[PDB]
Amino acid sequence: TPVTLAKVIKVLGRTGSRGGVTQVRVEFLEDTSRTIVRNVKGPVRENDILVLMESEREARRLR
Amino acid sequence: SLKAGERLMEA
Amino acid sequence: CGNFGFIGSSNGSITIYNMQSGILRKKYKLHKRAVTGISLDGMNRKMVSCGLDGIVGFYDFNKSTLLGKLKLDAPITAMVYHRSSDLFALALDD
Amino acid sequence: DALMVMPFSYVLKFLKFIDTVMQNKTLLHSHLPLICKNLFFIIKFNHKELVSQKNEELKLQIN
Amino acid sequence: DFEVVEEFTPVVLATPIPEEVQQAQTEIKLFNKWSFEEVEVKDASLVDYVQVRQPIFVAHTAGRYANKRFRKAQCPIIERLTNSLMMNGRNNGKKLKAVRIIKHTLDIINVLTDQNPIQVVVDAITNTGPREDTTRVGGGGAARRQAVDVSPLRRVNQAIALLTIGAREAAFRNIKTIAETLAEELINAAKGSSTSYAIKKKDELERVAKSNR
Amino acid sequence: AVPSVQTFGKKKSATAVAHVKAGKGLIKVNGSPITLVEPEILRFKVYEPLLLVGLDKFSNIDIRVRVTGGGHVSQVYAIRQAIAKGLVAYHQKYVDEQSKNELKKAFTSYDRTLLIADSRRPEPK
Amino acid sequence: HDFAVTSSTRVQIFSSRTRQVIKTFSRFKDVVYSASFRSDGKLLCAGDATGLVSVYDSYNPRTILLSINASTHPTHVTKFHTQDNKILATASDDRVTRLWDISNAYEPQLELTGATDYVRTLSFIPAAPHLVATGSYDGLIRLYDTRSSGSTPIYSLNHDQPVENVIAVSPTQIVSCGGNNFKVWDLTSNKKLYERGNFNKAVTCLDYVENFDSPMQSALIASSLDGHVKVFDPLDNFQVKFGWKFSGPVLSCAVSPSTAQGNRHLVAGLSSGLLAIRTKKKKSNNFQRM
Amino acid sequence: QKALPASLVPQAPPVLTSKDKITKRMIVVLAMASLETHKISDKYVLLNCDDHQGLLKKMGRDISEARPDITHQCLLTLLDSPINKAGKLQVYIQTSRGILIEVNPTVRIPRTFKRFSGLMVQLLHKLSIRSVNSEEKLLKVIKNPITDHLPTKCRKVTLSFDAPVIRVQDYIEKLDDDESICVFVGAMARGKDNFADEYVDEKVGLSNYPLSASVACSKFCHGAEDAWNI
Amino acid sequence: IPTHAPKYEENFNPDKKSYDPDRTRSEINKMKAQLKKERKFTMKEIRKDAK
RNA sequence: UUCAACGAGGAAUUCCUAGUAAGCGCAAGUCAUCAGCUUGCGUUGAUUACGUCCCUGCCCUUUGUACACAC
């Protein structure tokens, strides 16, 4: 399965996420203008790259 | 119990 | 900086000594005929040498590489480096 | 934060909402600074993706 | 052409220094054997978290990496492997034993697969770290999992953890020791053979995330 | 009568005094050579002040280190600190300042704990 | 400068300057059969009568590096590749040799079958690294291209007697011993060109020397179950030049390799249970200023 | 052309446990078993539907859920199945009170019921049971969750009645050469078949009829025997 | 697969100890526990009435 | 030869964020306490959080006041 890479541009704050899971807003690398909201598990900061097995799915909250 | 942002999104 | 002095010999070899302690630091060997002009940047970063075989050598100074070498059309007799604008003038043999 | 959580598809339909609401000039003028604050933060935050969208419908919408 | 003279007398010392030791002043190799140049991180998003750009002489940099958040993303990954190797109640504190068995396992990684063992362990990290995982979305305790993505520091953390504890359980009561089981684990994880504990665990975590995505 | 220089290297309770003076090039820790410093896996932790800057700096000076206190790894960290800042102080006082701060730049680019220890701790959160 | 002798259930590395056992490998369960060094001389493979190839590193008998579990039959010959470093060829009493990658030591990377009875020897061809010549007790030196299927030889050389050893002299010609003679085979033309039968009983083993300090530029020596080890010169038509007689039937022999640079050895191990080594050996500063 | 093995004398199969996470096997998990003990004053018993009128109602619970007989008759079926003799199975059970018990293949579970009751009392209170020959330890309470003990490559399905019905033979030859199969079967008298939602990715069934517990076990075992040629 | 029989006692009781088949080592363990509890209770009581 | 325990300890539960957890020994025995031990002292020294109020709780405020600008 072809995988894609996406750089964090903004760690979303004050979302009501479940603890240990943080929403994040990533823009792609093959077209560095379009973004998608993902939600990651470990510690994340800005401008680091993370690996999306799919990109056809926006993230809701977790709670 | 939603919050701001998702209430605005569903609206 | 006042730390380095540069000697250009008639057998074409630049030697770089320390002005405080008086010992050889480096030794560049590009030219084969007499080196008539040596100068260095105002930031000690690129040096420029000109010999009377008519090649101007451009070296990096911190790294000991050469950045390039330009062959003119006459043997060069004198260099003057204007150091703020980074422009040096050569009195050629023609 | 409420305007930063929402993705770009919701930003595009937010622009559709603003485009419809400034035809009804009654509730445009009773909510002018709120519409201005929200709309300018939305496109200021999403400016990089908005100027990479290619659709004359949205171009005429913004105008 | 052009050549620089920068030493002007052959350097000899009164204390005799071994020839390979004074050969080590032209390039820093790990244990004076394994070169750090041409060691790339063949998976992006993990470059800037597996650190191979400051070469070291031994995996015992006593620097302080646990007082800011992502400061352990620039501990050299050989030393992160070593520190993760020295953990259980039996082997706590014994960093010199951990460094010595890391030296032995890089020697036997190279003698089995005749390539750079730092490149082998870097490929093992970037193949082991899972790229997706599940959190348990609670609902008070409704047993349903939701697939999340996973950040690269967590991928390097869980990569080193999976590799080291896989080497422990693979050395638990067999004839092989921790150095030989870790060598087998790092080789199999580097090529990605699905015979290793580590990438079988990665495939299970990624498959469960694909399931309840 | 001789140009000489004394520095100190410390980790937890080990402490190492290094005397550097002009000489033939011999580096001696506790009387024995530097190539005998056990635990023999950190001998390159002791060596890296030499290999970071070249042995042509040590070709004209002789160092001696006296190390007391501490344990094995605290003693090798005291030795490497004493050697590093002793070479820097010798090139400050008796060789030129350009080689002095070239040595400081090389050691600080490798790790500044060759030159400055981490000394007073903890933090009361 | 060191050599490994495979007796029963131990392998002893002797030194070529003291001729005493420097190191020994005794943790085999049954009779160890073959023991050879890798081409880098860094590790040592030993095939054992239980079909367990165990490769240690040389000069460290305590670290068994990996134990390939080959066939349930006894594994009788184990040698690394001479060009490649990470492949090990083991033939066994299963009438099938196997090429193992020593990284993936679970399944054999290639399974060279095709021989009808008791494959006892491998050999590699010394310039083409894809070319494995194997020899069995039915005669019939098979040889395999490893890029192909590998279950069929590309051709077969009919030594009529059951072969005991096959070595490779040139990149082109190989020598097979078995029965009272040995034959040499051109390999580019699939064709026999010399045969010497100067023994009474079966030639057990061969080995070959090149470029060493000698009047003979090449030398093939042959060991033959009747006491004799003889040296044949490959440049004048494999004529015999010298020989030794020993106190019993000689089962295996070897000499020091081509670059020995010191005390040079000929070793022959007998079926009687003993080992025979024959070696050839090799004022004031004021006054000086005056 | 292919030779024989070097030894035709048949070895016993290697008995597998949780200390071997490599070998392909069949794990059978008896979920929601009713294994609780209780005091009489002087005596300890295992809670039945029949040893009491209202000990279970004094404890609060209902009497229909105290059925250790059905996990007994599942354990008998699994350990007399030929796949257990061939050594391709091990039996984990987990009590409705959240107690995980590992069951060795080498055990001889007693055939009558109250012998099994007296076995379960000592297992639940001593956490371990040795053999009469006392050389190994063959019935033991181990630590939750079960995924710490299951093999690292193991597809975990659960058994029910309302699910897309499969055939066990082609279902087991679908999975590959090192993947095991962990089959959560419920040992309840009745209940929702959701006892293992957090471990399982596939919820399947075997028939179109209301299938008893040990009949479901024996059906899956016989399908596995046909798929693995036993 | 070999098949061992499980060793367990019938009418198990955890609160009672196991029935050792020796009446002169189970007896010494019983009376060691008895002297320990009676000695502990005895000297506890005499030090608290001393207090 | 064959008749007790036991091969890292279940359910639950407690504590813990850098010279920290843990390993290791060596001394002392300081008017209370402690030797069925207590307190010092060094040696070796990590993994993972360093975010969040989603859960469990605890707390605070609900005129902005305190002086501009802004909200």
Short mmCIF file of C-alpha atoms in Angstrom, two decimals, chain E residues 50-181:
data_model
loop_
_atom_site.label_atom_id
_atom_site.label_comp_id
_atom_site.label_asym_id
_atom_site.label_seq_id
_atom_site.Cartn_x
_atom_site.Cartn_y
_atom_site.Cartn_z
CA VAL E 50 17.53 8.87 15.00
CA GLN E 51 20.78 10.77 15.32
CA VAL E 52 23.83 9.58 13.40
CA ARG E 53 25.44 12.89 12.52
CA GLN E 54 27.72 13.40 15.48
CA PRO E 55 30.10 10.43 15.49
CA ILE E 56 31.23 9.04 18.83
CA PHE E 57 33.94 6.71 20.06
CA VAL E 58 31.90 4.65 22.54
CA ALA E 59 28.24 4.47 23.56
CA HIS E 60 28.87 6.20 26.89
CA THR E 61 28.17 9.85 26.37
CA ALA E 62 27.26 10.84 29.91
CA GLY E 63 25.27 13.85 28.71
CA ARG E 64 21.93 14.81 30.15
CA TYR E 65 18.99 14.05 27.88
CA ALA E 66 16.11 13.69 30.30
CA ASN E 67 15.47 17.27 31.31
CA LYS E 68 13.72 18.61 28.23
CA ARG E 69 11.05 16.97 26.16
CA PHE E 70 12.58 16.11 22.79
CA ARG E 71 16.19 16.28 23.96
CA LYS E 72 16.49 12.50 23.77
CA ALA E 73 15.90 12.80 20.03
CA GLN E 74 19.58 13.72 19.69
CA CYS E 75 21.15 11.17 21.93
CA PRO E 76 22.99 8.94 19.42
CA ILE E 77 20.87 5.93 18.62
CA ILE E 78 23.62 3.48 19.55
CA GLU E 79 23.52 4.92 23.04
CA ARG E 80 19.72 4.83 23.14
CA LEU E 81 19.97 1.15 22.21
CA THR E 82 22.54 0.65 24.99
CA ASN E 83 20.43 2.43 27.61
CA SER E 84 17.37 0.45 26.63
CA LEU E 85 19.43 -2.72 26.85
CA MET E 86 20.37 -2.08 30.47
CA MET E 87 16.87 -2.43 31.90
CA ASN E 88 15.30 -4.97 34.20
CA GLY E 89 15.88 -5.52 37.92
CA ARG E 90 18.84 -7.80 37.18
CA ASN E 91 20.73 -5.42 34.92
CA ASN E 92 20.01 -1.93 36.17
CA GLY E 93 22.91 0.50 36.18
CA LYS E 94 25.26 -1.84 34.30
CA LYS E 95 26.03 0.45 31.40
CA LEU E 96 29.52 -0.93 30.90
CA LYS E 97 28.10 -4.42 30.50
CA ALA E 98 25.53 -2.98 28.09
CA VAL E 99 28.24 -1.16 26.10
CA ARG E 100 30.31 -4.34 25.98
CA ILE E 101 27.47 -6.45 24.64
CA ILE E 102 26.61 -3.73 22.11
CA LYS E 103 30.22 -3.93 20.94
CA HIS E 104 29.97 -7.71 20.65
CA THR E 105 26.69 -7.59 18.76
CA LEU E 106 27.97 -5.05 16.25
CA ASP E 107 31.03 -7.22 15.65
CA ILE E 108 28.90 -10.27 14.96
CA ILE E 109 26.34 -8.33 12.90
CA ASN E 110 29.22 -7.33 10.65
CA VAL E 111 30.72 -10.80 10.54
CA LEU E 112 27.37 -12.33 9.55
CA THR E 113 26.08 -9.66 7.16
CA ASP E 114 29.24 -8.07 5.79
CA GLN E 115 27.98 -4.50 5.88
CA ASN E 116 28.01 -1.56 8.27
CA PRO E 117 26.38 -2.53 11.58
CA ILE E 118 25.37 1.06 12.33
CA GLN E 119 23.50 1.04 9.02
CA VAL E 120 21.97 -2.29 10.03
CA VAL E 121 20.74 -1.00 13.38
CA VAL E 122 19.43 2.24 11.82
CA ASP E 123 17.49 0.20 9.24
CA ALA E 124 16.21 -1.96 12.09
CA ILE E 125 14.89 1.11 13.94
CA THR E 126 13.21 2.55 10.86
CA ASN E 127 11.64 -0.81 10.00
CA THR E 128 10.53 -1.63 13.54
CA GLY E 129 8.81 1.60 14.62
CA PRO E 130 5.05 1.25 14.06
CA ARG E 131 3.39 3.85 11.85
CA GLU E 132 -0.13 3.52 13.31
CA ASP E 133 -1.70 2.48 16.60
CA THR E 134 -4.95 2.32 18.55
CA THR E 135 -6.01 4.24 21.60
CA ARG E 136 -8.93 3.03 23.67
CA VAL E 137 -11.67 5.60 23.22
CA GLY E 138 -13.38 5.21 26.56
CA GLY E 139 -17.04 6.12 26.68
CA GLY E 140 -16.73 5.21 30.35
CA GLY E 141 -15.03 1.96 29.37
CA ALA E 142 -16.80 0.87 26.20
CA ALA E 143 -14.28 -1.62 24.80
CA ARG E 144 -13.80 -0.01 21.41
CA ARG E 145 -10.48 1.09 19.95
CA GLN E 146 -9.90 3.96 17.56
CA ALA E 147 -6.91 4.09 15.25
CA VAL E 148 -4.58 7.04 15.72
CA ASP E 149 -1.37 7.98 14.01
CA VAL E 150 1.84 7.91 16.01
CA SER E 151 4.55 10.54 16.26
CA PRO E 152 8.15 9.82 15.23
CA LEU E 153 9.59 10.09 18.73
CA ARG E 154 7.13 7.45 19.86
CA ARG E 155 8.12 5.38 16.84
CA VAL E 156 11.81 5.51 17.78
CA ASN E 157 11.00 4.84 21.46
CA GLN E 158 8.85 1.83 20.69
CA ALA E 159 11.34 0.63 18.07
CA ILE E 160 14.21 0.48 20.56
CA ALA E 161 11.90 -1.08 23.17
CA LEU E 162 10.61 -3.80 20.84
CA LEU E 163 14.10 -4.68 19.63
CA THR E 164 15.68 -4.88 23.07
CA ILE E 165 12.95 -6.82 24.86
CA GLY E 166 12.69 -9.13 21.86
CA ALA E 167 16.37 -9.85 22.27
CA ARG E 168 15.81 -10.52 25.99
CA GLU E 169 12.96 -13.01 25.52
CA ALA E 170 14.82 -14.59 22.61
CA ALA E 171 17.79 -15.09 24.94
CA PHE E 172 15.65 -16.12 27.93
CA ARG E 173 16.69 -19.75 28.29
CA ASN E 174 18.29 -20.72 24.99
CA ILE E 175 21.95 -21.45 24.28
CA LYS E 176 22.42 -18.00 22.78
CA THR E 177 23.25 -14.93 24.81
CA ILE E 178 21.87 -11.42 24.65
CA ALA E 179 24.55 -10.31 22.20
CA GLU E 180 23.84 -13.09 19.72
CA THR E 181 20.06 -12.86 20.02
#
